[PDB]
Write a protein that binds this ligand. Sequence first.
Ligand SMILES: Cn1c(=O)n(CCCO)c(=O)c2c1nc(Oc1ccc(/N=N/c3ccccc3)c(OC(F)(F)F)c1)n2Cc1ccc(Cl)cc1
Ligand SMILES: Cn1c(=O)n(CCCO)c(=O)c2c1nc(Oc1ccc(/N=N/c3ccccc3)c(OC(F)(F)F)c1)n2Cc1ccc(Cl)cc1
Ligand SMILES: Cn1c(=O)n(CCCO)c(=O)c2c1nc(Oc1ccc(/N=N/c3ccccc3)c(OC(F)(F)F)c1)n2Cc1ccc(Cl)cc1
Lengths: 145, 644, 645, 126, 46
Amino acid sequence: SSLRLISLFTANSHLGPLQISLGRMLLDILKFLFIYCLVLLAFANGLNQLYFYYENSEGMTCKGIRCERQNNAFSTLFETLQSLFWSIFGLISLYVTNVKADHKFTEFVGATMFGTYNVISLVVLLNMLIAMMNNSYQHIADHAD
Amino acid sequence: PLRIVRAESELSTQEKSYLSAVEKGDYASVKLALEEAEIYFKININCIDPLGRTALLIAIENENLEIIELLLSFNVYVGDALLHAIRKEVVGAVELLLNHQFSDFTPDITPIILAAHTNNYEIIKMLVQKGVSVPQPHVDSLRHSRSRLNIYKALASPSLIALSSEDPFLTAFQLSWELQELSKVENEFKAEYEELSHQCKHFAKDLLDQTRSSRELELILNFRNELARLKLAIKYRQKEFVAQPNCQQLLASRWYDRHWAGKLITCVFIGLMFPLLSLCYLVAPKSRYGLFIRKPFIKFICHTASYLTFLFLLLLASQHIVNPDRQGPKPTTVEWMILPWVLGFIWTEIKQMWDGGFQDYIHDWWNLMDFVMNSLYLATISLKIVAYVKYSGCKPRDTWEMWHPTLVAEAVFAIANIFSSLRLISLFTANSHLGPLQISLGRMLLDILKFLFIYCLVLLAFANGLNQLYFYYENSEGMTCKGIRCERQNNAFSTLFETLQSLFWSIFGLISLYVTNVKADHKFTEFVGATMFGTYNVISLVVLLNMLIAMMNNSYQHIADHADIEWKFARTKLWMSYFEEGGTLPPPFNINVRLNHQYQEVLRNLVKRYVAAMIRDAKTETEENFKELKQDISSFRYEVIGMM
Amino acid sequence: PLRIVRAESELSTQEKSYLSAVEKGDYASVKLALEEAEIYFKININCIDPLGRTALLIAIENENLEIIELLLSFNVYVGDALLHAIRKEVVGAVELLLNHQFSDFTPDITPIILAAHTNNYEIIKMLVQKGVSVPQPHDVDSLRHSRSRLNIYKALASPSLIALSSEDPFLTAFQLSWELQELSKVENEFKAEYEELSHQCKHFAKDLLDQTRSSRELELILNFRNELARLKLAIKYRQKEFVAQPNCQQLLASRWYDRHWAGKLITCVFIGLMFPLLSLCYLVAPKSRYGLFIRKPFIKFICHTASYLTFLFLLLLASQHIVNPDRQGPKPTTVEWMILPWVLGFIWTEIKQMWDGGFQDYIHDWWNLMDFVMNSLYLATISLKIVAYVKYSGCKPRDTWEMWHPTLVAEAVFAIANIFSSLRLISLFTANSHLGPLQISLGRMLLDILKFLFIYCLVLLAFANGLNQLYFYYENSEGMTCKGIRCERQNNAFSTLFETLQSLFWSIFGLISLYVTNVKADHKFTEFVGATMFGTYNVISLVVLLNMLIAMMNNSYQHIADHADIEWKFARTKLWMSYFEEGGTLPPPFNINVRLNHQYQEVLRNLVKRYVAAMIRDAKTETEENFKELKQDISSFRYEVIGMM
Amino acid sequence: IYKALASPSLIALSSEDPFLTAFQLSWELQELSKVENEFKAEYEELSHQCKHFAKDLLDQTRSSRELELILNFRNELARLKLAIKYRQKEFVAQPNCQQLLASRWYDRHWAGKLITCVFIGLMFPL
Amino acid sequence: YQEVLRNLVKRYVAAMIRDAKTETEENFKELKQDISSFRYEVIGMM
Ligand SMILES: Cn1c(=O)n(CCCO)c(=O)c2c1nc(Oc1ccc(/N=N/c3ccccc3)c(OC(F)(F)F)c1)n2Cc1ccc(Cl)cc1
Ligand SMILES: Cn1c(=O)n(CCCO)c(=O)c2c1nc(Oc1ccc(/N=N/c3ccccc3)c(OC(F)(F)F)c1)n2Cc1ccc(Cl)cc1
Ligand SMILES: Cn1c(=O)n(CCCO)c(=O)c2c1nc(Oc1ccc(/N=N/c3ccccc3)c(OC(F)(F)F)c1)n2Cc1ccc(Cl)cc1
């Protein structure tokens, strides 16, 4: 209800043209969301497959990533898909890659998967979203009045 | 389909030869055609063309004064042929026609208006000599709109201004002012009006470009105290006129009246002993330094060192050398030194207030910032005075009640120190490298302020839906803290104020993920709240903050285009604020008969040079080598006639 | 400065007027001046004006033939006037001069080479009719050896010369453009001119193909020398412009396809649902009803895609808790038995593709090395599983297993393996008109990212060296059950090189806390130094280094996106042509010329004739078309006046 | 055929109502640029030239009396609504018809407009 | 409406021909015209 008040911006000489050009650099973002979703699915399918054999629920008041002491980040597909999403904003801690065992080899592989996902999605994928958005505003503002 | 002809007819079978004779340059045939048609031979010497051109019209397209004279020798209808000749740039046809329902011109067009539209010195002069007038610009909306744009277009032509204006400089200053005002009230015709305003601004610069001496330039800028016409050129916002190389070179000679580490040391040394120069100017301004402080560059340096000393005193107020925690304390030794600076700033602002009469005083950012800072300082002084006579005594600061006057005074003083240190930005326009950067950094700041209208709406929309869901779960049992600003963040969405606070700190990632939890087993409302938080996070940084920089890039391109005239305008405005007398003491202290003839001669010479340059700028610029080719064949034809 | 004219001379007092008369076009004056036959009053007919122009060369500059013939009748010295006439493109001067130390032309320049340079059809044909030969392109004064080689390649790569002296202009343009591209890599000083010469050769083939009038001609050009033989030959030579032509793209799409937004996706899904029906029908009976239906390339593409999405489904279903506890050395489950046919089919396809090319141009592409890594990882997984099954048995708690256990490594490698399997599916974006150009221009700007890694890694190593050298003497391991930065209380960030190298990587994303720079001692000076170096690394990598990685990507996106439709069309046709043949119509789960020359040359002759006609008779206008109109009028006037009297 | 049927000279010479053929042909030349995707960059430009022709034709009005007759041909503003349906953004965003529309819409300074708008909006129930 | 449309089309045609014929390209015509006039005068005298 409160997000429909923006449609009234097309009545001011200043906020009018800006809103029209904003809604035209939005079909470009939709096209770029078919790659991030595939990358997210590909990395979740690996992280969950690696970490699904270490699911524990002993002596914990809560269970999930939305907790004071995060745990079971990659235990299930539902939690893996939404723990990777929250890592774009830096709200997932590093210790969630550990397990209750001395298996140092698997923890390193999981941390490497997490870091590889972080690199691709944040410095390789979100930087070329700006590159094509800036190079499409030029072709949009030519016919904007 | 079967294509046909609609609403048209055929011309003739005999008039085709007559119309082709004037087209192919023949003269004997056209002589015979009109001579034989004397006794009503039904040839209709006023024919028509597929393009709509009569016999007289074609003779003007291909300029042939002999055919035109032969035609006007007989009784032929002229109609709007004078307008056609004026628009077709034929001086001979215009001269011939001057002394002798379907139209392609609007009813409001007069020959003088169209000639001024064409911008030709000879035709405009010829029309003016015979005596013409233009209506004064002040039911039908379409006709009244395209009748004042035509008048203003004809009134802003450089040729007409140079021809029939008593003072072409003033009528170019005022014309650009009226045309720029009219663009605001005339939203449909806004591009047309703003282009004419720019044209009148370049005319003044081009007319000033024809000064061949330093005595002619010192006579134009000093007309009607010192630099009187230069100050008037700024009131009308003539950026091109001010930012002229000769004007800047003349102004730099009054500003100043070497390597970087031969001048930085000199500036530091000069600014080291500003109190000595101030004392010398205050006790005896005869020889030693009573005029040294009067130099604009020395005065600028001394005024900067005084402000830098003031900022250093505000840094020493927080040192623990300069008090216990007692209610209503006496001012420290540092604040006693701070007081004169504040009093001087207040006095300067007061003495500057009445000059503008509260009109255009609050027009720039810096004057409003000064007002806010001065008001905050006055509030600090008032609160410190109040707290001394009523809320006295000594008490531990942990036991004080919030809203205590001694606390509000310190808070208001702390806020005022931020504004006084940010005022140092305005000194960046005096540098060649930091100058243009600051101008481009303040003109795209207004660009940002338009994207902050949508962020407020999005923030309000999401805070409406988060609080509405999370308000019923508020609890404060066993909690010494209540809010997000503590180690265990809680009640993040329990009230509208804290919902607005916690939705702003999430832009920088300072809000943890467990604040979306409740002390219950309701795992469906928790997921919904987390989804709202995530959706707000998505379209605030990935989407909304990405198009903020996408348009910043493409608005910096236009700003940086003309970025050297704006910086020079700002620097000249900063410079001339130190030329005059009054305010030469730092804030720590201080607590026309034989005049018009020369100008008229200079103006006559300048206009003559301008017209001499403008005739060559058009008659020569692959068009100059077109009249020689016609002259060669004309001479050949004349020679052949002479021999034959 | 009292300046003077250095290193010059003066011409004469008499021949200046003769040169002026020659310039003005006065026939009588220059005729009587030259009448000093064998008795001259010290006037040289070979005088040189101060700008180097000669009387014979002056008439060439105005292409006025009367004084040209008059001078030629008196045996004036020519020397190189033919080259000047060729360069200025005057047909009459070349006609007259063809039958009769300082030079402004490079010594190895021959008239044919310069004529081919000017790209004038008439002069080249005129010279060829007499019989000439350009040296073949196939070291002591290397400056003029490279210049001479460049000149003959510029003459060879001219549309006019190719159109009248080539057996097959469609073939001499493919090879010559290929060798021009690879010759720009061995001569790096002239790489900007060799590569711009090859680009004009690719446009020539496209322009020659643009002159087809009917579909009968087009299908005969591309089928020369089983099907679409010449079209595949152009793909081998990387002729993107030739391939991405609308007229041939239409035919290729007609072969590919052999409705609205909601009317196409639904039927695509409907076709893809019964993937294993008309795949077993193919094996049972290849009849027109069902066996030949999958033969359509569009249907075959959908079958291979739905069969791959099915593989990605039960790949996602192998991590479910429903489908062999935590037992040591287990047998494969029921999902892995279904997984095995897909892996076997992929391995068989890679094996049959391996020897088909001999690892030349087969592993050079990025979409084959990833596949090889994927099958290698799958093979390692199955080998580790079968090794662990025969030497390990007994149910044991998982927490008690020692690391490097074969089962653990097997599942880790399997988890790594299927990440690449899902990421390979991004290669199908090139078949869609919306995600096609976006994906093609996505992996092309990615190559510019690889160059910032070479400086990022150097900065990382430089700072890691200093951080380790400072902090390696303070490490401790008592009272710490958990050790490292992947812990609730990070304690040993900069203790070893391996830990320092990865604690600086995690600081890009802000996952390293500020208390990891503290030591268990009252040494404030070293702690401050370590914090300062950590902050300096943060500033350089996040405020400077990564800020200017995006500052060029948009400035390089402009060049990439300029011709972004030709590359996408080339990729799409490369994808299409892999489904046009027989051999791949079996998804991996179910796989475990006497007259021809006559017609071709008779079509090509007409094509070349149309091209040359449109190139000469339709390019004089491209203002210059009306310049000769005034000359025609003046010539008619002159002829009428002269003949009347 | 389409490139010849879109020429302004032929429309201005052999059309009963050129304001309608520039609307109808510009619409069917825009949706035709999708079925023939191979030749689409030239069909789109062909449709674009049929949109500027209408704007140029409507730019020849001399008085406001004839302008109100063009926009009201065939209730009120019957042809302005028809142009919006055909997505003729150039025919609609013309200064003369903008100025006419603004007079119907409205039927002051920065601080003299907001203070009046808020007063009007604060007394809307009555 | 038909009368107004006729006026509009006539004005548009006039503007189109004026803009197309005039737009350097017009400078060619005044050369051909004077050449033809001189030629016709020469033939008339002879
Ligand atoms: C993806 N990732 C990752 O997930 N974690 C988490 C591990 C779990 O704790 C890292 O710690 C890490 C990392 N990436 C790097 O740094 C580079 C830098 C450049 C590279 N390549 N540059 C180029 C340049 C040009 C051409 C080709 C490659 C590169 O790739 C590489 F070297 F192959 F691994 C890795 N680190 C830090 C690190 C590095 C080395 C070591 Cl021995 C230990 C930690
Ligand atoms: C907004 N958000 C969110 O608040 N949380 C927090 C929930 C509680 O913490 C998420 O966890 C989350 C999320 N977004 C995604 O991932 C996508 C990405 C793109 C999508 N669609 N893209 C397009 C692009 C173009 C056209 C159409 C769609 C999409 O589909 C969806 F849901 F419809 F947005 C979901 N996740 C992670 C996640 C995903 C799936 C599942 Cl089952 C669980 C978690
Ligand atoms: C790199 N770094 C850092 O690692 N830590 C961590 C130390 C332990 O936690 C800081 O705290 C820090 C810092 N940088 C600054 O602030 C600047 C910023 C720009 C400067 N100059 N910019 C330019 C730009 C162009 C040309 C010349 C100079 C500059 O001047 C200086 F010192 F020279 F860098 C200082 N601070 C905060 C700080 C400031 C002052 C003080 Cl006394 C203490 C802390």
